[PDB]
RNA sequence: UUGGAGAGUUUGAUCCUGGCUCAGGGUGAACGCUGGCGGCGUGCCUAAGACAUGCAAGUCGUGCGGGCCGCGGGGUUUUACUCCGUGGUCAGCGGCGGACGGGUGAGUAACGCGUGGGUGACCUACCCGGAAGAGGGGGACAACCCGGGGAAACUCGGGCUAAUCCCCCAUGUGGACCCGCCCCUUGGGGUGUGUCCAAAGGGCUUUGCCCGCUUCCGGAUGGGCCCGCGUCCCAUCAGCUAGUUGGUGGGGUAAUGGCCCACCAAGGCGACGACGGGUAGCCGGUCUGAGAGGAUGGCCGGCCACAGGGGCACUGAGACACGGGCCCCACUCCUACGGGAGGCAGCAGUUAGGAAUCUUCCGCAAUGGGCGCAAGCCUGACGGAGCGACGCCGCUUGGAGGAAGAAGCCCUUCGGGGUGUAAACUCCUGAACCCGGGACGAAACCCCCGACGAGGGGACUGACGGUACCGGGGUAAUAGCGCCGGCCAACUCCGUGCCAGCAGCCGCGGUAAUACGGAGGGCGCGAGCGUUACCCGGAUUCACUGGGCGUAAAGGGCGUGUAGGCGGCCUGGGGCGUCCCAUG
RNA sequence: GCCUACGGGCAGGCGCCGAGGGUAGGGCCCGUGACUGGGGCGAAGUCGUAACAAGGUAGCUGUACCGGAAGGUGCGGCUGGAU
């Protein structure tokens, strides 16, 4: 069963590619409470249809670019920046906390 | 070319074999495919050899040259008796 | 300080030269057939493509052409030809 | 070194009669008769209250020394006994009483436990048909622990059975003196044992 | 519910906090004292240091041609020269095997490994099955012969010649590629025209059977690539990245792919810890633990990684190839100083280093592997032996009787206590040792009959080993180490005198030492016992189980709010977490 | 040049990449080390008495300056100050 993940487009700067934020949930291997973790997959859009802030289903595909082995399945829920915003503010925060 | 052979399992002076099926190229005592009987050289137990012809037949069918000695045990089991 | 299982190297050389002349042979022929289609020599071009296709499949018979290898070469050649024969249509032979 | 040194001295260390020599440990002399004090230059001295450990200890030994068996086996047994479904203590005495060398003793084919050993190592013992020299061997229920045809006319053994006409055999055992045979019926029950020990202490000891 | 023991130690004394310590189990061990036996297992943990010697992969004359030595037979009236057959021997050409098996852990924190999946992105020698075919023509190179270079290793040139080596031509069951359509649905399948592609012979019991050969579909086994989850320490490492992230096209592969190139775009990753550094092959399992967890990952098995250091490709089903190749580098050795020759991390051994880790043994009988129609060849894979108490397990040094109790040694309140049934002595059994018998493991392939099927009959063949083991005969025949103040089972005397020394911790020793040193005695364990080192444990002393922060060590000097965590009542949908069933 | 059925193949040549080296500069880690801070230990000398009782000028403390020394003083804070 080729894997399927549901996530969100966060990046749309690339060519025919979209970065998808995929959230996963699970009990901590020892402490027990539900930890929420995530990963970004570089999906693949041929006809450049998928747009930022769209939730999509990812499916395991034939290797494409170095680190781009997934095609996008179908659009789940369109228009929902809400989530992006988070990813974004988190990224921005990164600018802080350093030795520059 | 997958063969059908024995596997050392006894010990120092206590050989106890294991009829199995595996790819030629593997070790004697290495990862086999489907264990189909064991044979006891010394014959201490009235049950010093078993087989399950049903599976034996599978292999040969699919193509699996058995060891000379190996075969001998399959013959004793009536692996090929067509009557 | 000897070992007769070296005859193999004594042999490999034989095949190195063997394979070599065949492989290159193809390259040349392909590269030949190619520049023909550029000029639009519908007749001869193929006259050559054909000598090509053969050579390829001939090495495929042996240990010179991996198998599907012949195939790729058969695709990458013919395709590169058909297309060029658009700059001046009508394939003479076939 | 499976012990073998001064004996009815241990009869003395424990303060309880240790039937280690048989005849004699019945005549006024397993020494406990007339010299109950323990050995040593301080035997006759007032003894201080024994630490929990001490009792747990002394009682292990009492068990052990009776069967006269190198701690290593003894502890091994106790280990094997913990792995069996049962009362961790009763089962202990189980194998403990199931050793070939012991059996012979209970069967009466010998004056004492010690004596029984030799009888075994020298091979005067049949077991379900074949001889056996390994005492530590475990006599399964329903085995004919006997005497070798060869050994039957023995000045020892003979004089022993002669005595048997006059003593009942353990309830879990049978024997046909007439033919010098004997069978091991079933594992003996704690209630059946006589031993002046308290397994509980023994068990309690092996958890330190 | 088959499962969980604590103690010493800060005080004049208490309680608490808290650390240190011990008892337990274990080891691929080492050192010390002692050391009889057998069975099974196991033995470089350190210099992946350097390595003499020997052996560790070859095999086919039922693929083809010959050289050396020799034998038998032919054509010769005879001689020289020759024709056939043949034994040994050599190597070549050609096929298969060398890509398995053996080692080792350096590297590696990584899709490397664990786990579960994908492959419409794949290959797969030999095996099995099913379908189809093997027609005609030609060629080269060793061996061999002639010559030249070199100290050597070896090398150059000229000429002959066979084949299941090579080439060409035809047939095409079929298969390939382009294009078109029909079905599917990422490069899956059907189909049409065009084009391209086959092949070797050998053996007999030779009018047929065996081995082998060609194209294709399928099988089986083996494997490449890919993805999700899992995967050590440091934040006194915080920002890393330029083929770097993506796109088009092209190359390259069995194949997807920045893997590689060109051009274009400007990206990609990072506190859910990027990058940097440190360390380590990973797992099944194993050790400990009541468990949760912690520790480990040698022997055995599975996967990876290297085969002096680094680079690279060839040949091939498969290698970027430990005992194949090309180059540079370090090192060793030959050298006529031009130039070469080497790689034990295979078995055994050598030396070095170290606390420390074995025999240059036996056998190819068995199991396995290769090559062979087979007989058979090779197999330091293996199966055995040997050395090491290095581990575990079994076993012995005897059994019974024997004094109100020898002697000696120890103690004493001098009367006696003790060592001690211990000894002596009595009888009995009888390890060692001696003689005889003597093994399974081994039944095949082969041969014969039968249809080289099934089935049945015959023959050969053991390293261990004259060993195990049975029978008979047969001697009373090794014991040692630690400890004895508390934890902690085991107490007296003497010597000593803060000395000599002990010591894990608290401590002990300045003339009365249950703590030093000997002795008598005693406890503990027994061919062993101690010691050191290291793991888990005790330690709920990193606390998920299962901790804390008023004064014991601990609340951030306060606020503000970012990420993030956490969140009120009723009803419904979805059901991701979550629970149940089946199944792989 | 070598071979050829003249289609073409080998030899050779050039080129890219490239192990490695050279020169310049930077960074980072190991060994040895002159010179040098303090530290902890231990019986114990020396000068003084800071702290512990209101320790005999209550103590403690951030800071600041000063001084054989411990410490004294200013300023602020605290009670973990006796009456
Ligand atoms: Zn007695």
JSON list of C-alpha atoms (C1' of nucleotides) in Angstrom, two decimals, chain E residues 470-559:
[
{"chain": "E", "resi": 470, "resn": "C", "atom": "C1'", "xyz": [30.55, -54.31, 27.40]},
{"chain": "E", "resi": 471, "resn": "G", "atom": "C1'", "xyz": [33.24, -58.61, 30.06]},
{"chain": "E", "resi": 472, "resn": "G", "atom": "C1'", "xyz": [36.96, -60.32, 33.44]},
{"chain": "E", "resi": 473, "resn": "G", "atom": "C1'", "xyz": [41.05, -58.90, 37.11]},
{"chain": "E", "resi": 474, "resn": "G", "atom": "C1'", "xyz": [42.53, -55.25, 40.01]},
{"chain": "E", "resi": 475, "resn": "U", "atom": "C1'", "xyz": [45.58, -51.31, 44.40]},
{"chain": "E", "resi": 476, "resn": "A", "atom": "C1'", "xyz": [42.42, -47.13, 50.06]},
{"chain": "E", "resi": 477, "resn": "A", "atom": "C1'", "xyz": [44.52, -44.03, 46.07]},
{"chain": "E", "resi": 478, "resn": "U", "atom": "C1'", "xyz": [45.34, -35.37, 45.31]},
{"chain": "E", "resi": 479, "resn": "A", "atom": "C1'", "xyz": [43.37, -30.72, 49.00]},
{"chain": "E", "resi": 480, "resn": "G", "atom": "C1'", "xyz": [43.30, -26.11, 48.82]},
{"chain": "E", "resi": 481, "resn": "C", "atom": "C1'", "xyz": [42.00, -20.78, 49.33]},
{"chain": "E", "resi": 482, "resn": "G", "atom": "C1'", "xyz": [39.31, -17.01, 52.00]},
{"chain": "E", "resi": 483, "resn": "C", "atom": "C1'", "xyz": [37.61, -15.55, 56.34]},
{"chain": "E", "resi": 484, "resn": "C", "atom": "C1'", "xyz": [36.64, -15.40, 62.08]},
{"chain": "E", "resi": 485, "resn": "G", "atom": "C1'", "xyz": [35.51, -6.16, 65.39]},
{"chain": "E", "resi": 486, "resn": "G", "atom": "C1'", "xyz": [30.36, -4.26, 62.86]},
{"chain": "E", "resi": 487, "resn": "C", "atom": "C1'", "xyz": [27.78, -5.05, 58.15]},
{"chain": "E", "resi": 488, "resn": "C", "atom": "C1'", "xyz": [29.01, -10.82, 58.19]},
{"chain": "E", "resi": 489, "resn": "A", "atom": "C1'", "xyz": [28.60, -17.62, 59.86]},
{"chain": "E", "resi": 490, "resn": "A", "atom": "C1'", "xyz": [33.46, -18.15, 62.91]},
{"chain": "E", "resi": 491, "resn": "C", "atom": "C1'", "xyz": [37.24, -16.83, 69.40]},
{"chain": "E", "resi": 492, "resn": "U", "atom": "C1'", "xyz": [41.25, -18.10, 72.84]},
{"chain": "E", "resi": 493, "resn": "C", "atom": "C1'", "xyz": [46.83, -17.35, 73.83]},
{"chain": "E", "resi": 494, "resn": "C", "atom": "C1'", "xyz": [51.12, -15.55, 72.85]},
{"chain": "E", "resi": 495, "resn": "G", "atom": "C1'", "xyz": [54.49, -11.61, 70.16]},
{"chain": "E", "resi": 496, "resn": "U", "atom": "C1'", "xyz": [53.78, -6.66, 69.69]},
{"chain": "E", "resi": 497, "resn": "G", "atom": "C1'", "xyz": [53.34, -1.64, 71.88]},
{"chain": "E", "resi": 498, "resn": "C", "atom": "C1'", "xyz": [50.40, 5.01, 67.20]},
{"chain": "E", "resi": 499, "resn": "C", "atom": "C1'", "xyz": [56.00, 0.72, 65.98]},
{"chain": "E", "resi": 500, "resn": "A", "atom": "C1'", "xyz": [55.30, -3.35, 62.40]},
{"chain": "E", "resi": 501, "resn": "G", "atom": "C1'", "xyz": [51.24, -3.38, 60.03]},
{"chain": "E", "resi": 502, "resn": "C", "atom": "C1'", "xyz": [45.53, -3.84, 58.54]},
{"chain": "E", "resi": 503, "resn": "A", "atom": "C1'", "xyz": [41.81, -1.52, 55.96]},
{"chain": "E", "resi": 504, "resn": "G", "atom": "C1'", "xyz": [35.63, -1.74, 51.38]},
{"chain": "E", "resi": 505, "resn": "C", "atom": "C1'", "xyz": [33.45, 1.81, 54.73]},
{"chain": "E", "resi": 506, "resn": "C", "atom": "C1'", "xyz": [33.33, 3.14, 60.37]},
{"chain": "E", "resi": 507, "resn": "G", "atom": "C1'", "xyz": [38.07, 2.22, 62.01]},
{"chain": "E", "resi": 508, "resn": "C", "atom": "C1'", "xyz": [42.06, -0.89, 64.61]},
{"chain": "E", "resi": 509, "resn": "G", "atom": "C1'", "xyz": [47.55, -0.38, 66.92]},
{"chain": "E", "resi": 510, "resn": "G", "atom": "C1'", "xyz": [50.95, 4.48, 72.42]},
{"chain": "E", "resi": 511, "resn": "U", "atom": "C1'", "xyz": [52.06, -2.96, 77.25]},
{"chain": "E", "resi": 512, "resn": "A", "atom": "C1'", "xyz": [45.32, -6.25, 79.05]},
{"chain": "E", "resi": 513, "resn": "A", "atom": "C1'", "xyz": [44.43, -5.67, 70.78]},
{"chain": "E", "resi": 514, "resn": "U", "atom": "C1'", "xyz": [37.97, -11.02, 69.66]},
{"chain": "E", "resi": 515, "resn": "A", "atom": "C1'", "xyz": [40.54, -5.51, 64.24]},
{"chain": "E", "resi": 516, "resn": "C", "atom": "C1'", "xyz": [48.57, -6.30, 63.38]},
{"chain": "E", "resi": 517, "resn": "G", "atom": "C1'", "xyz": [51.98, -11.11, 63.09]},
{"chain": "E", "resi": 518, "resn": "G", "atom": "C1'", "xyz": [51.84, -16.86, 64.50]},
{"chain": "E", "resi": 519, "resn": "A", "atom": "C1'", "xyz": [49.41, -20.52, 66.73]},
{"chain": "E", "resi": 520, "resn": "G", "atom": "C1'", "xyz": [44.95, -23.76, 68.67]},
{"chain": "E", "resi": 521, "resn": "G", "atom": "C1'", "xyz": [40.16, -23.50, 67.49]},
{"chain": "E", "resi": 522, "resn": "G", "atom": "C1'", "xyz": [35.98, -22.11, 64.16]},
{"chain": "E", "resi": 523, "resn": "C", "atom": "C1'", "xyz": [32.90, -20.50, 59.83]},
{"chain": "E", "resi": 524, "resn": "G", "atom": "C1'", "xyz": [32.46, -20.53, 54.72]},
{"chain": "E", "resi": 525, "resn": "C", "atom": "C1'", "xyz": [33.44, -22.89, 49.85]},
{"chain": "E", "resi": 526, "resn": "G", "atom": "C1'", "xyz": [35.94, -27.35, 47.43]},
{"chain": "E", "resi": 527, "resn": "A", "atom": "C1'", "xyz": [39.75, -28.79, 42.34]},
{"chain": "E", "resi": 528, "resn": "G", "atom": "C1'", "xyz": [39.06, -24.89, 43.72]},
{"chain": "E", "resi": 529, "resn": "C", "atom": "C1'", "xyz": [39.21, -20.29, 46.57]},
{"chain": "E", "resi": 530, "resn": "G", "atom": "C1'", "xyz": [40.59, -15.27, 46.77]},
{"chain": "E", "resi": 531, "resn": "U", "atom": "C1'", "xyz": [42.03, -10.37, 44.24]},
{"chain": "E", "resi": 532, "resn": "U", "atom": "C1'", "xyz": [41.64, -6.70, 40.69]},
{"chain": "E", "resi": 533, "resn": "A", "atom": "C1'", "xyz": [38.81, -4.67, 36.57]},
{"chain": "E", "resi": 534, "resn": "C", "atom": "C1'", "xyz": [34.08, -3.85, 34.12]},
{"chain": "E", "resi": 535, "resn": "C", "atom": "C1'", "xyz": [28.10, -4.42, 33.54]},
{"chain": "E", "resi": 536, "resn": "C", "atom": "C1'", "xyz": [23.02, -4.32, 36.02]},
{"chain": "E", "resi": 537, "resn": "G", "atom": "C1'", "xyz": [21.72, -4.33, 41.30]},
{"chain": "E", "resi": 538, "resn": "G", "atom": "C1'", "xyz": [20.97, -2.45, 45.83]},
{"chain": "E", "resi": 539, "resn": "A", "atom": "C1'", "xyz": [19.93, 3.70, 44.34]},
{"chain": "E", "resi": 540, "resn": "U", "atom": "C1'", "xyz": [12.39, 5.72, 44.24]},
{"chain": "E", "resi": 541, "resn": "U", "atom": "C1'", "xyz": [20.43, 8.82, 44.30]},
{"chain": "E", "resi": 542, "resn": "C", "atom": "C1'", "xyz": [17.60, 11.46, 37.10]},
{"chain": "E", "resi": 543, "resn": "A", "atom": "C1'", "xyz": [12.07, 9.57, 40.22]},
{"chain": "E", "resi": 544, "resn": "C", "atom": "C1'", "xyz": [7.38, 6.85, 33.12]},
{"chain": "E", "resi": 545, "resn": "U", "atom": "C1'", "xyz": [6.44, 3.39, 36.97]},
{"chain": "E", "resi": 546, "resn": "G", "atom": "C1'", "xyz": [8.51, 6.07, 41.47]},
{"chain": "E", "resi": 547, "resn": "G", "atom": "C1'", "xyz": [11.52, 12.53, 43.72]},
{"chain": "E", "resi": 548, "resn": "G", "atom": "C1'", "xyz": [11.84, 17.49, 44.91]},
{"chain": "E", "resi": 549, "resn": "C", "atom": "C1'", "xyz": [12.33, 23.10, 45.81]},
{"chain": "E", "resi": 550, "resn": "G", "atom": "C1'", "xyz": [9.64, 28.16, 53.46]},
{"chain": "E", "resi": 551, "resn": "U", "atom": "C1'", "xyz": [14.72, 27.10, 56.61]},
{"chain": "E", "resi": 552, "resn": "A", "atom": "C1'", "xyz": [18.04, 20.97, 54.26]},
{"chain": "E", "resi": 553, "resn": "A", "atom": "C1'", "xyz": [20.80, 21.88, 47.23]},
{"chain": "E", "resi": 554, "resn": "A", "atom": "C1'", "xyz": [16.37, 24.02, 44.51]},
{"chain": "E", "resi": 555, "resn": "G", "atom": "C1'", "xyz": [11.23, 29.47, 42.24]},
{"chain": "E", "resi": 556, "resn": "G", "atom": "C1'", "xyz": [13.58, 32.60, 37.47]},
{"chain": "E", "resi": 557, "resn": "G", "atom": "C1'", "xyz": [14.76, 40.25, 40.89]},
{"chain": "E", "resi": 558, "resn": "C", "atom": "C1'", "xyz": [9.34, 41.82, 38.40]},
{"chain": "E", "resi": 559, "resn": "G", "atom": "C1'", "xyz": [6.42, 42.36, 34.35]}
]
